[PDB]
Amino acid sequence: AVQKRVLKSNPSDLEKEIAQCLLDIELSSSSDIKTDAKEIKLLSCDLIEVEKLKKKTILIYIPYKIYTTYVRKIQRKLINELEKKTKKYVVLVAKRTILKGKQKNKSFKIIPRSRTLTSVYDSILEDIVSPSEIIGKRISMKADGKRVFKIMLDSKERQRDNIEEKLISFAAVYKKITRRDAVFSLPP
């Protein structure tokens, strides 16, 4: 009864669990928001670990339309709820597709710059932090032939128990998505 329908895959380990959790939330009306999992769905998930003592964190790949309409609007509440339920840190992202420039889709004629790789990456960075909003990207080229993206977020997150850990998780997720090193921070 539903639950399989809330995701858009063949049920696998953690996606199903997430769906169940969502359903429970819908049923219950925890904290404030109600009937918001009626609106939500998901495409897929990925559990990822980090350089830690412990902890595994979760990507939730969401169909783009849904993300634009509902998830963008109520994200903080949702994420917090998820955290409360499943102690694994979670991040929503939109499953947005990337297209090669020179290639010729049946669709379009000229790729929109929304779909360009760089743009997509930027958008996913924006997504992944969402309690907060980016202040300034800044890409340190190390002398070793590496590139580090040194992102710095606003205030707001500074009032939380999970700060540094959260940042680390974000970094890890970014790496997973785009084989890119990243580092996160805030201002004093």
Partner RNA sequence: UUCAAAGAAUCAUUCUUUUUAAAAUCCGGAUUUGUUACUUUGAGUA
Partner RNA sequence: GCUUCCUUCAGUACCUUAUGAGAAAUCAAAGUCUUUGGGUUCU
Least gap, CB of 168 to other proteins (angstroms): 21
**Binding-site member from 54, 145, 159, 179 for other proteins (CB under 8 A):** 145
End-to-end CA distance of the chain: 50
- Choose from other proteins, RNA, none: what does 158 bind? Cβ within 5-8 Å by kind: none
Q: How far apart are CA 89 and CA 130, in angstroms?
A: 13
CA atoms within 13 A on the CB side of 99: 16
Least gap, CB of 79 to RNA (angstroms): 24
Least gap, CB of 20 to other proteins (angstroms): 32
Nearest CA to 85 among 34, 132, 169, 28? 28
For binding to RNA (CB under 7 A), which residues are involved?
97-106, 111, 113, 116-119, 144-147, 178-180
Q: How far apart are CA 38 and CA 14, in angstroms?
A: 19
- Choose from RNA, other proteins, none: what does 105 bind? Cβ within 5-8 Å by kind: RNA
Whats the size of the chain, residue-wise?
A: 188
Site residues, other proteins (CB under 8 A): 126, 133-143, 145, 150, 154
